[PDB]
PDB file of C-alpha atoms in Angstrom:
ATOM      1  CA  UNK E   1       0.000   0.000   0.000  1.00  0.00           C
ATOM      2  CA  UNK E   2       2.997   2.217   0.794  1.00  0.00           C
ATOM      3  CA  UNK E   3       4.545   1.469  -2.649  1.00  0.00           C
ATOM      4  CA  UNK E   4       1.494   1.803  -4.912  1.00  0.00           C
ATOM      5  CA  UNK E   5       3.764   3.754  -7.388  1.00  0.00           C
ATOM      6  CA  UNK E   6       6.142   0.732  -7.599  1.00  0.00           C
ATOM      7  CA  UNK E   7       3.714  -2.205  -7.979  1.00  0.00           C
ATOM      8  CA  UNK E   8       2.270  -2.990 -11.391  1.00  0.00           C
ATOM      9  CA  UNK E   9      -1.368  -1.917 -11.502  1.00  0.00           C
ATOM     10  CA  UNK E  10      -2.775  -4.745 -13.624  1.00  0.00           C
ATOM     11  CA  UNK E  11      -1.123  -7.324 -11.244  1.00  0.00           C
ATOM     12  CA  UNK E  12      -3.104  -7.547  -7.957  1.00  0.00           C
ATOM     13  CA  UNK E  13      -1.598  -9.034  -4.783  1.00  0.00           C
ATOM     14  CA  UNK E  14       1.962  -9.210  -6.064  1.00  0.00           C
ATOM     15  CA  UNK E  15       3.673 -11.150  -3.187  1.00  0.00           C
ATOM     16  CA  UNK E  16       4.267 -14.914  -2.745  1.00  0.00           C
ATOM     17  CA  UNK E  17       4.810 -15.621   0.941  1.00  0.00           C
ATOM     18  CA  UNK E  18       6.409 -18.617   2.697  1.00  0.00           C
ATOM     19  CA  UNK E  19       6.926 -19.027   6.429  1.00  0.00           C
ATOM     20  CA  UNK E  20       9.386 -21.740   7.432  1.00  0.00           C
ATOM     21  CA  UNK E  21       9.739 -22.905  11.060  1.00  0.00           C
ATOM     22  CA  UNK E  22      13.560 -22.924  10.927  1.00  0.00           C
ATOM     23  CA  UNK E  23      15.542 -19.687  10.729  1.00  0.00           C
ATOM     24  CA  UNK E  24      19.263 -19.736   9.746  1.00  0.00           C
ATOM     25  CA  UNK E  25      21.838 -20.510  12.443  1.00  0.00           C
ATOM     26  CA  UNK E  26      21.995 -17.576  14.867  1.00  0.00           C
ATOM     27  CA  UNK E  27      19.019 -15.551  13.613  1.00  0.00           C
ATOM     28  CA  UNK E  28      15.758 -15.506  15.485  1.00  0.00           C
ATOM     29  CA  UNK E  29      13.992 -14.526  12.328  1.00  0.00           C
ATOM     30  CA  UNK E  30      15.080 -13.755   8.731  1.00  0.00           C
ATOM     31  CA  UNK E  31      13.697 -13.301   5.231  1.00  0.00           C
ATOM     32  CA  UNK E  32      14.867 -13.767   1.634  1.00  0.00           C
ATOM     33  CA  UNK E  33      13.697 -11.141  -0.743  1.00  0.00           C
ATOM     34  CA  UNK E  34      12.957 -11.789  -4.410  1.00  0.00           C
ATOM     35  CA  UNK E  35      11.702  -9.063  -6.796  1.00  0.00           C
ATOM     36  CA  UNK E  36      10.953  -9.060 -10.521  1.00  0.00           C
ATOM     37  CA  UNK E  37      10.805  -5.413 -11.539  1.00  0.00           C
ATOM     38  CA  UNK E  38      10.802  -3.309 -14.712  1.00  0.00           C
ATOM     39  CA  UNK E  39      13.741  -1.561 -12.884  1.00  0.00           C
ATOM     40  CA  UNK E  40      16.192  -4.298 -14.125  1.00  0.00           C
ATOM     41  CA  UNK E  41      15.931  -2.643 -17.577  1.00  0.00           C
ATOM     42  CA  UNK E  42      18.990  -0.682 -16.363  1.00  0.00           C
ATOM     43  CA  UNK E  43      21.177  -3.849 -16.307  1.00  0.00           C
ATOM     44  CA  UNK E  44      20.083  -4.595 -19.921  1.00  0.00           C
ATOM     45  CA  UNK E  45      20.548  -0.956 -21.123  1.00  0.00           C
ATOM     46  CA  UNK E  46      24.011  -0.963 -19.465  1.00  0.00           C
ATOM     47  CA  UNK E  47      25.144  -4.201 -21.074  1.00  0.00           C
ATOM     48  CA  UNK E  48      23.818  -3.151 -24.493  1.00  0.00           C
ATOM     49  CA  UNK E  49      25.224   0.414 -24.579  1.00  0.00           C
ATOM     50  CA  UNK E  50      28.658  -0.966 -23.391  1.00  0.00           C
ATOM     51  CA  UNK E  51      28.224  -3.802 -25.949  1.00  0.00           C
ATOM     52  CA  UNK E  52      27.534  -1.337 -28.819  1.00  0.00           C
ATOM     53  CA  UNK E  53      30.667   0.636 -27.794  1.00  0.00           C
ATOM     54  CA  UNK E  54      32.861  -2.406 -28.444  1.00  0.00           C
ATOM     55  CA  UNK E  55      30.620  -3.921 -31.197  1.00  0.00           C
ATOM     56  CA  UNK E  56      29.788  -1.058 -33.657  1.00  0.00           C
ATOM     57  CA  UNK E  57      33.578  -0.494 -34.099  1.00  0.00           C
ATOM     58  CA  UNK E  58      34.350  -4.320 -33.844  1.00  0.00           C
ATOM     59  CA  UNK E  59      36.743  -4.241 -30.852  1.00  0.00           C
ATOM     60  CA  UNK E  60      38.135  -7.642 -29.659  1.00  0.00           C
ATOM     61  CA  UNK E  61      35.897  -9.483 -32.159  1.00  0.00           C
ATOM     62  CA  UNK E  62      38.815 -11.353 -33.744  1.00  0.00           C
ATOM     63  CA  UNK E  63      39.107 -13.372 -30.467  1.00  0.00           C
ATOM     64  CA  UNK E  64      35.562 -14.692 -30.907  1.00  0.00           C
ATOM     65  CA  UNK E  65      35.502 -15.069 -34.740  1.00  0.00           C
ATOM     66  CA  UNK E  66      38.968 -16.618 -34.470  1.00  0.00           C
ATOM     67  CA  UNK E  67      37.328 -19.343 -32.366  1.00  0.00           C
ATOM     68  CA  UNK E  68      34.586 -19.588 -35.090  1.00  0.00           C
ATOM     69  CA  UNK E  69      31.659 -17.187 -34.440  1.00  0.00           C
ATOM     70  CA  UNK E  70      30.449 -14.886 -37.154  1.00  0.00           C
ATOM     71  CA  UNK E  71      28.846 -11.429 -37.125  1.00  0.00           C
ATOM     72  CA  UNK E  72      25.524 -13.109 -37.685  1.00  0.00           C
ATOM     73  CA  UNK E  73      25.808 -14.833 -34.282  1.00  0.00           C
ATOM     74  CA  UNK E  74      26.343 -11.467 -32.663  1.00  0.00           C
ATOM     75  CA  UNK E  75      23.351 -10.169 -34.702  1.00  0.00           C
ATOM     76  CA  UNK E  76      21.041 -12.934 -33.423  1.00  0.00           C
ATOM     77  CA  UNK E  77      22.134 -12.270 -29.825  1.00  0.00           C
ATOM     78  CA  UNK E  78      21.667  -8.473 -30.352  1.00  0.00           C
ATOM     79  CA  UNK E  79      18.190  -9.040 -31.938  1.00  0.00           C
ATOM     80  CA  UNK E  80      17.148 -10.996 -28.829  1.00  0.00           C
ATOM     81  CA  UNK E  81      18.679  -8.287 -26.573  1.00  0.00           C
ATOM     82  CA  UNK E  82      16.897  -5.333 -28.295  1.00  0.00           C
ATOM     83  CA  UNK E  83      13.629  -7.361 -28.027  1.00  0.00           C
ATOM     84  CA  UNK E  84      14.144  -8.253 -24.297  1.00  0.00           C
ATOM     85  CA  UNK E  85      14.899  -4.642 -23.209  1.00  0.00           C
ATOM     86  CA  UNK E  86      11.862  -3.612 -25.298  1.00  0.00           C
ATOM     87  CA  UNK E  87       9.765  -6.268 -23.491  1.00  0.00           C
ATOM     88  CA  UNK E  88      10.666  -4.400 -20.276  1.00  0.00           C
ATOM     89  CA  UNK E  89       9.674  -0.963 -21.717  1.00  0.00           C
ATOM     90  CA  UNK E  90       6.447  -2.505 -23.141  1.00  0.00           C
ATOM     91  CA  UNK E  91       5.313  -3.113 -19.515  1.00  0.00           C
ATOM     92  CA  UNK E  92       6.739   0.184 -18.162  1.00  0.00           C
ATOM     93  CA  UNK E  93       3.850   2.625 -17.683  1.00  0.00           C
ATOM     94  CA  UNK E  94       1.378   0.023 -18.987  1.00  0.00           C
ATOM     95  CA  UNK E  95      -2.005   0.395 -17.319  1.00  0.00           C
ATOM     96  CA  UNK E  96      -5.217  -1.283 -16.129  1.00  0.00           C
ATOM     97  CA  UNK E  97      -7.184   1.487 -17.975  1.00  0.00           C
ATOM     98  CA  UNK E  98      -8.782   0.619 -21.358  1.00  0.00           C
ATOM     99  CA  UNK E  99      -7.576   1.823 -24.805  1.00  0.00           C
ATOM    100  CA  UNK E 100     -10.026   2.745 -27.600  1.00  0.00           C
ATOM    101  CA  UNK E 101     -10.472   1.408 -31.121  1.00  0.00           C
ATOM    102  CA  UNK E 102     -10.541   3.090 -34.525  1.00  0.00           C
ATOM    103  CA  UNK E 103     -12.081   3.244 -38.065  1.00  0.00           C
ATOM    104  CA  UNK E 104     -10.558   3.867 -41.557  1.00  0.00           C
ATOM    105  CA  UNK E 105     -10.384   7.217 -43.352  1.00  0.00           C
ATOM    106  CA  UNK E 106      -9.437   8.173 -46.969  1.00  0.00           C
ATOM    107  CA  UNK E 107     -12.488   9.402 -48.994  1.00  0.00           C
ATOM    108  CA  UNK E 108     -13.650  12.762 -50.399  1.00  0.00           C
ATOM    109  CA  UNK E 109     -15.707  14.158 -53.253  1.00  0.00           C
ATOM    110  CA  UNK E 110     -16.748  17.565 -54.623  1.00  0.00           C
ATOM    111  CA  UNK E 111     -19.916  18.071 -52.590  1.00  0.00           C
TER     112      UNK E 111
ATOM    113  CA  UNK L   1      97.967  17.236 -66.305  1.00  0.00           C
ATOM    114  CA  UNK L   2      95.213  18.896 -64.170  1.00  0.00           C
ATOM    115  CA  UNK L   3      95.261  17.365 -60.616  1.00  0.00           C
ATOM    116  CA  UNK L   4      92.646  17.948 -57.809  1.00  0.00           C
ATOM    117  CA  UNK L   5      90.475  14.873 -58.565  1.00  0.00           C
ATOM    118  CA  UNK L   6      87.608  14.195 -60.901  1.00  0.00           C
ATOM    119  CA  UNK L   7      84.104  14.194 -59.311  1.00  0.00           C
ATOM    120  CA  UNK L   8      82.286  11.919 -56.775  1.00  0.00           C
ATOM    121  CA  UNK L   9      78.488  11.791 -56.156  1.00  0.00           C
ATOM    122  CA  UNK L  10      76.703  11.749 -52.742  1.00  0.00           C
ATOM    123  CA  UNK L  11      74.313   8.931 -51.674  1.00  0.00           C
ATOM    124  CA  UNK L  12      71.038  10.808 -50.894  1.00  0.00           C
ATOM    125  CA  UNK L  13      67.436   9.816 -51.765  1.00  0.00           C
ATOM    126  CA  UNK L  14      63.953  11.410 -51.331  1.00  0.00           C
ATOM    127  CA  UNK L  15      61.346   9.961 -48.868  1.00  0.00           C
ATOM    128  CA  UNK L  16      57.588   9.034 -48.957  1.00  0.00           C
ATOM    129  CA  UNK L  17      54.977   6.975 -46.949  1.00  0.00           C
ATOM    130  CA  UNK L  18      53.876   5.231 -50.231  1.00  0.00           C
ATOM    131  CA  UNK L  19      50.047   5.875 -49.874  1.00  0.00           C
ATOM    132  CA  UNK L  20      50.033   2.690 -47.723  1.00  0.00           C
ATOM    133  CA  UNK L  21      46.853   0.639 -47.207  1.00  0.00           C
ATOM    134  CA  UNK L  22      45.547  -1.393 -44.219  1.00  0.00           C
ATOM    135  CA  UNK L  23      42.201  -2.710 -42.842  1.00  0.00           C
ATOM    136  CA  UNK L  24      39.673  -0.701 -40.811  1.00  0.00           C
ATOM    137  CA  UNK L  25      36.396  -2.170 -39.482  1.00  0.00           C
ATOM    138  CA  UNK L  26      35.370   1.147 -37.745  1.00  0.00           C
ATOM    139  CA  UNK L  27      35.519   3.179 -41.065  1.00  0.00           C
ATOM    140  CA  UNK L  28      32.667   1.066 -42.571  1.00  0.00           C
ATOM    141  CA  UNK L  29      29.980   2.647 -40.255  1.00  0.00           C
ATOM    142  CA  UNK L  30      28.334   6.074 -39.535  1.00  0.00           C
ATOM    143  CA  UNK L  31      24.819   5.107 -38.182  1.00  0.00           C
ATOM    144  CA  UNK L  32      23.316   3.042 -35.312  1.00  0.00           C
ATOM    145  CA  UNK L  33      20.571   0.335 -35.609  1.00  0.00           C
ATOM    146  CA  UNK L  34      16.856   1.142 -34.837  1.00  0.00           C
ATOM    147  CA  UNK L  35      15.298  -0.118 -31.528  1.00  0.00           C
ATOM    148  CA  UNK L  36      13.386  -3.372 -30.790  1.00  0.00           C
ATOM    149  CA  UNK L  37       9.553  -3.709 -30.639  1.00  0.00           C
ATOM    150  CA  UNK L  38       8.276  -1.962 -27.411  1.00  0.00           C
ATOM    151  CA  UNK L  39       4.540  -2.807 -28.078  1.00  0.00           C
ATOM    152  CA  UNK L  40       2.162  -5.425 -26.650  1.00  0.00           C
ATOM    153  CA  UNK L  41       0.229  -7.740 -29.057  1.00  0.00           C
ATOM    154  CA  UNK L  42      -1.219 -10.264 -26.489  1.00  0.00           C
ATOM    155  CA  UNK L  43      -3.654  -7.923 -24.688  1.00  0.00           C
ATOM    156  CA  UNK L  44      -7.439  -8.490 -24.963  1.00  0.00           C
ATOM    157  CA  UNK L  45     -10.437  -6.277 -23.910  1.00  0.00           C
ATOM    158  CA  UNK L  46     -12.516  -9.222 -22.491  1.00  0.00           C
ATOM    159  CA  UNK L  47     -15.911  -8.460 -24.188  1.00  0.00           C
ATOM    160  CA  UNK L  48     -18.679 -11.004 -23.367  1.00  0.00           C
ATOM    161  CA  UNK L  49     -20.009 -11.611 -26.939  1.00  0.00           C
TER     162      UNK L  49
END
């Protein structure tokens, strides 16, 4: 309730609990956190901007192609990457509120 | 006789960097690739027909 700005609005009741009888040695209680957030889009942006900085100029590539890769293999891994970082931004600022629908236009005559 | 030697030539030659040619991978580019698809295609408006 405190973090309504940081929970996705079309996903109700976001948390999976579990409550084990046995805490770790020495701790009277503990908990493991696990979060899946749109925020991780900053790991993927960071990798892919740093990747493009080596890649677009072809830095160190002879070490990989010299083992037997090709540029294509890089291209298939980049195509996945640009899709996966887009699949984050697709859900960023996505809503529970409904979007409209449209007709076609293109016709005119003298009167 | 006329003494004082004949003539001797110097060893000196002009210099150039020969318009030399190498490889460059970086020179073959000026533009970046367009982005991936940021748009949902799975969503449905749940109308009871």
